Design a protein around this ligand. Sequence first.
Ligand SMILES: O=S(=O)(O)OC[C@H]1O[C@@](COS(=O)(=O)O)(O[C@H]2O[C@H](COS(=O)(=O)O)[C@@H](OS(=O)(=O)O)[C@H](OS(=O)(=O)O)[C@H]2OS(=O)(=O)O)[C@@H](OS(=O)(=O)O)[C@@H]1OS(=O)(=O)O
Ligand SMILES: *[C@@H]1O[C@H](CO)[C@@H](O)[C@H](O)[C@H]1NC(C)=O
Ligand code: NA
Length: 197
Amino acid sequence: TGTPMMPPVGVQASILSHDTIRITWADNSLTDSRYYTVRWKTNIPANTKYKNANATTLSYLVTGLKPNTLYEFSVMVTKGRRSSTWSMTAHGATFELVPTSPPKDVTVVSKEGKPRTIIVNWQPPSEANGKITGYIIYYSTDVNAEIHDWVIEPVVGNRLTHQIQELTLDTPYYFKIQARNSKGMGPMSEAVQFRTP
Ligand SMILES: O=S(=O)(O)OC[C@H]1O[C@@](COS(=O)(=O)O)(O[C@H]2O[C@H](COS(=O)(=O)O)[C@@H](OS(=O)(=O)O)[C@H](OS(=O)(=O)O)[C@H]2OS(=O)(=O)O)[C@@H](OS(=O)(=O)O)[C@@H]1OS(=O)(=O)O
Ligand SMILES: *[C@@H]1O[C@H](CO)[C@@H](O)[C@H](O)[C@H]1NC(C)=O
Ligand code: NA
């Protein structure tokens, strides 16, 4: 007992998924009663509570993380009544994930002059889990029709407005929107009803 113990060296983060980052380290001061405690927290906001975990090996797999999120990691060694201060901090940002929220605040308005033309306006989804690459607008004269029967209107790029031309006058029309990121298409919005003049 010649207190205190040397904190871990060579702390490294390895990105595995949208929710998994693998932490490895080195223990120069090396079967006995000792154990490591891994701590992690989201880089932003500045003040956040740390999550902890015990590990007997010189590795720990941090699970259940937020997608497209940057985390701070540290390790410490605990042996009996002795302990090491926290190690050097390692950083890792989880992979992206398909959006898991639909585009929000969807609105449909007729184009000034041209009534067979409508302007769809929306907002990005909350749970976007990555950079929005684009959107897909679906529309029908039957809200009950299967998604494949609906008219497909791709919206290339992260624009929040789109124009649809050549539609039937004085007709109820229904509108759904879904978002896109590198990992695929996220959910669709609830159908919004708009009757043409
Ligand atoms: O001297 S005693 O055997 O009575 O135990 C007290 C402390 O010895 C240390 C080092 O201090 S010193 O020997 O008094 O100078 O043990 C730590 O280092 C040696 C090997 O390194 S050395 O400096 O080249 O001698 C290891 O073996 S041993 O001499 O203790 O038998 C230790 O490995 S072990 O984990 O104890 O099995 C090593 O301890 S540790 O990895 O740091 O926990 C003190 O530790 S130190 O000051 O942090 O380096 C010993 O305290 S202890 O709690 O009894 O281990
Ligand atoms: C680690 O185990 C120690 C007992 O060995 C306990 O005090 C501590 O709360 C455990 N931590 C976690 C997060 O499992
Ligand atoms: Na993306």
